[PDB]
């Protein structure tokens, strides 16, 4: 039981885009093109852009789900550590076990899969303003990569699926995530190896 991570642009040319924030110490979120990897801080805004070549149907939704990047951990459900699950950081919408939240959207929906037990967060797709190129969603990651009892220093991927009103697959993309105290420093360091 592991969700597919195969990239699939689909009929609407579904792609992800990210801000070009750089690696100065003050950045709270930064994306590495070379590593296809997002470096972000705990509970801080994480902008992800949805790009499409054609506007998807009314009722289209997009879903985010985390899985472990390493094959020997892939079947394990990614969830918050007991400490953070018990933290008083609720937004009144997200379940306490869920790693990924959506910020600033009251139509957000959260799922515990009854069969796979996977967590995911789903949101109604809205097309960009006519003068805009893409739709920006603000995610929050509610555990650090280094959380004891949670991700436990294990790398994760976030999978974003585009789906129709019936939940049929329309598109898929993914990116690796590290949730850390110093995204800029950590990105610059990880790219040093290239
Ligand atoms: Zn944690």
DSSP string, 13-35: T-EEE-------TT-SEEEETTT
What are the φ/ψ torsions at residue 185 (nearest 5 degrees)? -60, -50
Cα separation values, 40 from 47, 133, 145, 149, 172, Å: 10, 24, 10, 20, 22
From edge to edge, which strands make up the β-sheet containing 135-141? 15-17, 46-51, 135-141, 100-103
Look up the domain containing 129 and give its range.
1-194
Query: How many CA atoms lie less than 13 Å away from 45 in the CB half-sphere?
Result: 11
- Separation of 85 CA from ligand 1 center, angstroms? 7
* Distance (Å) from CA 190 to ligand 1 centroid: 22
Number of domains into which the chain is organized: 1
Expressed in angstroms and rounded, the spacing between residue 87 Cα and the centre of ligand 1 is: 9
Q: How was this structure obtained? A: X-ray
Q: Which residues are annotated as a binding site for Zn(2+)?
A: 81, 84, 143, 147
135 CA to centre of ligand 1 in angstroms: 29
The reported resolution of this PDB entry, expressed in Å, is: 1.5
Q: What is the CATH number of the domain that holds 96?
A: 2.60.40.720
| Residue 132 Cα to ligand 1 middle (Å) | 36
């Amino acid at each position: 039981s592991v969700p597919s991570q195969k990239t699939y642009q689909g009929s609407y040319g579904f792609r992800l885009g990210f801000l070009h924030s750089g690696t100065a110490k003050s950045v709270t979120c930064t994306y590495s093109p070379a590593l296809n990897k997002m470096f972000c801080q705990l509970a801080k805004t994480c902008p992800v852009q949805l790009w499409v070549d054609s506007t998807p149907p009314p009722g289209t939704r997009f879903r985010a789900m985390a899985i472990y990047k390493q094959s020997q951990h892939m079947t394990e459900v990614v969830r918050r550590c007991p400490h953070h699950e018990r933290c008083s950081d609720s937004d009144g919408l997200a379940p306490p076990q869920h790693l990924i939240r959506v910020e600033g959207n009251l139509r957000v929906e959260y799922l515990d899969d009854r069969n796979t037990f996977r967590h995911s967060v789903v949101v109604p797709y809205e097309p960009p303003e006519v003068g805009s190129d893409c739709t920006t969603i603000h995610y929050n990651y509610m555990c650090n990569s280094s959380c004891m009892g949670g991700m436990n220093r294990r790398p994760i991927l976030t999978i974003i699926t585009l789906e129709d009103s019936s939940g049929n697959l329309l598109g898929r993309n993914s990116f690796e995530v590290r949730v850390c105290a110093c995204p800029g420093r950590d990105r610059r360091t990880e790219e040093e190896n290239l």
